[PDB]
Structure 1
C-alpha cells in the first residue's frame, strides 16, 4: 500500500516516526526558502513541510511542479509542532506522483464555485471530494450498520427475496415490466408478500435491506425510481403497537449511532442532530384531520393525508411537542391495503401506521390479517381477484401466526435525518424520470 496512515490516524505516539501518507494534492505554497504541500484524503488534509536546508534538493524543486488533484504518495517523518495548524507536519523524504489530473476539473472541489445538482450527479467522483458531501455518504454507511446491528441484537434473521417477479400486486401501477426469456415479469416494488409468507416458516423475525423499483412518471424531491428499502416482519405479536415500539427504538438507535460516531461529519454539515425522545407521540388519523382542519387543510374522512397535510402536521408537532418524529395511526380501513388487520371492535379503522420525520413519511407498516378467510374477503372488498394471490394465500392455510411489520425507506430516513432539501443528496447515482446515467 502507498500509505500506512490516514490524516486522522496520526497521533502523538508517532512523533518522530516515519509514516506514509497518500491522497490528492489540495494546495502547494512555494514561499522561497520553504515550501508547503497539502494532501487531502477521505478524513482531511495533511501538511507536508519542506525547509530548504532540511529536504532533498530534487524534492525541493519537485513540489512547485505538483498540480491540483494530482494523486501523490509521501513518506516522511512525523513532527508535532504548535506551528502546524492540525498539530503535526510531515518532513518529506520521498514524494511520488502516482497519477496526474487533467485540467480544467468538472467541479470545484474547493467549494468556491458552486455547481448545479445535475453537474454534481454527473461527476459524483469529484463531488465527494468536498467534505460536506463525503460527510453524507459516511453517515449513510453508519446508518445501515446501526440498523442491521439493532436487528441482530433483537433476534432478527436477514433474508433475501426475489427482485424479478411475475406475481400480482394490489396497485398494479408504476411497475417496471421486463421479459424473462419466454415469460413476462416485473421488477419488485416491495418484498411484502414474500416476508409475510416466511412468517409461516418459523423464522419469526426477519429483515431485508435491498433495492426496490417504482416507475414513477413524475419527479419529486422525496422519491426516486430506485430505492433501498429496510423491510421487517415479526410474528407472535399481540397488536401493532409492538411493531411501532420496535421501529421507533430502531430509528432511535440509528440516530444515536450517528450522533456518537459521526460528530465530525455533523459538525462539517453545521448540523445539530437531536437526541431521540422515546416514546414518540402517537397521533390518530381522526385527531390528525381535526388539527389540519383548524389549519385550513380539509381532508374528507376516509382518504389519504397528502403532501401538504404531512408538512402542516410535522410543523404542528414540532411547535407543540418539540417532536421531529411522531406516528400517525388508526387509519381508515378503506385507505389501507387488504393485508392490514382491521380493529375487530371498530372495522372502519385498521391497525396500520406511518412514521413521520420532519413532516415526511419515512416508514409505514402495521399488523397483518393472518386469518385466511378474513384476508380473502378483504381482497374481494378491494375489488381484486383472490385467485391471483393464491401462492401467497396458501401460506395462511397451514398454521400462520399473528404478525406485523414495516417498510422503512433508507433514502428518506437519511434525507430527513440531516434535513436535506433533496433526496438526490443521499444516494450516489439517482434514477428518475429523466435520469438513467451515470
Structure 2
C-alpha cells in the first residue's frame, strides 16, 4: 500500500479552487474573492499602529511566514511585515478537526506569503518576540506565494546579535552580500535602509526650506587618475567622481543655491571597511554675502538639524532601536555649539596628547592620516563630550585646485571638514571666484587648463562669491549608527572585488 503516501502528497500540494468552500490551500490571486466581492486586507503595519474595528470580527491579514512551530493539535506561525511581527495560532479543535489542514500548514516553507482569515485577541502572556501584542486565531489560511528554494541561511541566525555563546551561528558578510535579497529581510537591515531614506528626506527638505533648488548634472564626462573610463561613441570619457565642476557652473549661472543627490564613481583599487567604488553623494553649493563662514555655519546647522530629526519621534526611535538590537552602539552625541578647531590647533592637540611627533620644521607640510583623525575624535569626545566637530584652515597645498587660499597667509586655505565619531563626512571650501586667480592656481597645481576650459570659462563673465561641500550618504548613516562597515549602509555595495548582485 502506497496510495496513502500519494494521497498525503495530494494534501501537501492542495490547490484551493473556492475560498468560500475551503479553509486552506495554495491560491491564485485571481481566486481571492470572498462572497463575490473584495476582501478588506490588512497589513501588519496598520495593525500595529491601530492597536499599539480590528477586534470586532474576523479580519484578513497578509504577511510572510517568519517562523512556524508545530505542536501537535496546535501550530504557531509568526507573520512578518517590515519591522512588525504577530503570532497566529492554528488549533484544529477549532477547525473541524481537519488533520489535513494541519498537515498542509506544517509543511509550509518559511518566507512563504499567506493570507490569513482570523480573529484577533490579546493573550495573558504575549510573545516577547512580536511587537504586536495581539494574536490571530486562524480560521482560514491560503498561500499566495510559496518559497521555492531552500534558504541560503536562516533569518533567525541572520538576525542574531553576534556573540561567542556556544551554539551561535554567524552569517558572514560574503554570504549575506551574495544573497542580499534575503539578508535585507533582517529587522536591522530593513531599519538601516529606512533610516537612509530618512537622511535623504531631511537633507532635501532642509535645503528646500532654505530656498535651494535641486539640480541634476551628468556623470558621463569628457575629462575627469582614479576614474573609470568609458568609450563614448569613439570619444574617451570618464565617470564623474563628483559633480563639483557642474554645481559651480550652476552658481556662476545665477542659481544661487543648489544641491544634488546622485551617484558618484571612484576607481581606486582599495579594499577597506569604508571604501566603495560607487556611492551616493549629497552635494551643496551656494553663494555668500561677504564671509564664507556664513555658509559654514549654515552647513553646520544642516547637520545639527539632521541629527535632531533622526533622533526624534516614534518612527525614527523605533528604527534606531531595531538596528541597535543587533548592532549596539552608544547614541550619537552632539552639542548646541559645534566645536571648531583650526588644522594647526588640531595638530597641536595631537602633539600635546602624545599621539603625534613632528618637528616644527615638519608641521607645515604634515598631512593628517585617517588613524590620526580617529585619535583626534577620541581626544575631542573626552574633552568636549561630542561625536561631531569641525576642522577649518587646512594648508592650501593639501586641498584641491579650486580652493581659495587666504590672501594674508596664502599657505592657508579657507577649507573645512566635518567629522562624526572621528571620521570625515563632509569636505568643502570657499571657491576661487576670480577667473585669473583660478587660472593661476590651476597652473600652480600643474593641471591641464585645456581639459577644464568649459569650467574655467564659466567664471569669465563674473562670478558670485561662493562655497560648497560634498557629503557621503552611506558614510553619514554608518557613522551615525556606529556600524562597522560601509557595506551595511549601501543596498548593493560596489567594491573592487564585488560587482554582483
Q: TM-score, normalised by structure 2?
A: 0.82
Corresponding residue for 1:39? 79
Is 2:303 the counterpart of 1:214? no
Q: For residue 335 of structure 1, what is the aligned residue in structure 2? A: 398
In structure 2, the gaps of 5 or more residues are: 1-28, 33-39, 158-167
The structure 2 residue matched to 1:410, chosen from 466, 473, 478, is 473
Given that 1:266 and 1:272 are in contact with CA atoms closer than 8 Å, whether structure 2 keeps it comes out as: no
Question: Does residue 92 of structure 1 match 2:138?
Answer: yes
Q: Distance in 1 between matches of 2:58 and 2:317?
A: 29
Residue in 1 that maps onto 2:386 = 323
- Tell me if structure 1 keeps the 8 A contact 2:333–2:385: no
Answering whether residue 498 of structure 2 is matched by residue 435 of structure 1, we say yes
Are residue 106 (structure 1) and residue 159 (structure 2) matched?
no
> What are the superposed Cα offsets for residues 165-216 of structure 1, whole Å, 9 maximum, x if unpaired?
013x5xxx21101100121100000010100011122211100010000101
Q: Give the equivalent residue in structure 2 for 1:67.
A: 109
- Contact 2:394–2:414 (8 Å) recurs in 1: yes
Q: CA deviation at 1:93?
A: 2.9
Is the contact between residue 401 and residue 445 of structure 2 (CA under 8 Å) also seen in structure 1?
Answer: yes
Q: Which runs of 4+ in 1 moved over 6 A?
A: none
RMSD between superposed Cα atoms in Å:
2.0
User: Which has the higher Rg, Structure 1 or Structure 2?
Assistant: 2
Query: Alpha-carbon deviation of 1:416?
Result: 0.7
Match status 1:371 vs 2:434: yes
**Which residue does 1:117 correspond to in 2?**
173
* Closer, same or farther: CA 130–138 of 1 in aligned 2, 3 Å: same
Give the corresponding residue for 1:227: 279
Shift of 1:316: 0.7
Q: Is the 8 A contact 1:256 1:276 kept in 2?
A: no
Does 1:165 find its partner at 2:228? no
1:288 counterpart = 2:328: no
Among 113, 133, 154, which residue is 2:189 paired with?
133
Name the residue aligned to 2:228: 176
Determine the C-alpha separation between the residues in 2 that align with 1:317 and 1:199: 35
5+ residue gaps, structure 1, are none
Q: Is the 8 A contact 2:258 2:286 kept in 1?
A: yes
Matched, 1:262 2:316: yes
The answer to whether residue 43 in structure 2 is matched with residue 6 in structure 1 is yes
Task: State the partner residue of 1:396.
Answer: 459
Moved more, 45-54 or 173-182: 45-54
1:103 deviation in Å?
5.3
Q: Write the distance in 1 (CA, Å) between the matches of 2:337 and 2:294.
A: 12
TM-score by length of 1: 0.93
Greater mean deviation of Cα atoms: 188-197 or 139-148: 139-148
CA distance in 1, matches of 2:391, 2:492: 32
Aligned-partner SS, 2:156: coil
Match of 2:67 in 1: 27
Structure 1 residues 276-329: Cα deviation after superposition (integer angstroms, max 9, x where no partner): 323311111101111222324236322421112111101111011112011111
Structure 2 residue aligned with 1:153: 209
Give the distance between the partners of 2:253 and 2:267, measured in 1 at CA. 32
Secondary structure of the 1:75 match is strand
CA distance in 2, matches of 1:351, 1:5: 56
Distance in 1 between residues matched to 2:311 and 2:378, nearest whole Å: 23
Shift of 1:83: 4.2
SS at structure 2 position matched to 1:238: coil
Pairwise CA distance, 1:385: 3.1
Aligned 8 A contact 1:161 1:191 in 2: yes
Shift of residue 427 of structure 1?
0.5
Offset of residue 344 of structure 1: 2.0
Select between 333-342 and 288-297 the one with higher mean Cα deviation: 288-297
User: 1:246, 1:342 → 2: CA distance?
Assistant: 21
Distance of aligned partners of 1:237 and 1:96 in 2 relative to their CA distance in 1, 3 Å threshold: farther
User: Which stretch of structure 1 is more off in the superposition, 115-124 or 33-42?
Assistant: 33-42
Cα distance between partner residues in 2 of 1:411 and 1:8 = 26
C-alpha displacement at 1:275, in angstroms? 5.2
Deviation at 1:381, TM superposition (A): 1.0
Q: Do 2:241 and 2:266's aligned partners in 1 also have CA atoms closer than 8 Å?
A: yes
Q: 1:18 to 1:204 in 2, by over 3 A?
A: farther
> Which residue of the other structure, out of 54, 73, 94, is the alignment partner of 2:94?
54
Query: Any idea what SS the aligned residue of 2:104 has?
Result: helix
Stretch of structure 1 that moved more, 204-213 or 19-28: 19-28
Q: 1:271 to 1:19 in 2, by over 3 A?
A: farther
**Residue 411 of structure 2 aligns to a residue in which SS?**
strand
How many positions carry a matched residue from both structures?
A: 434
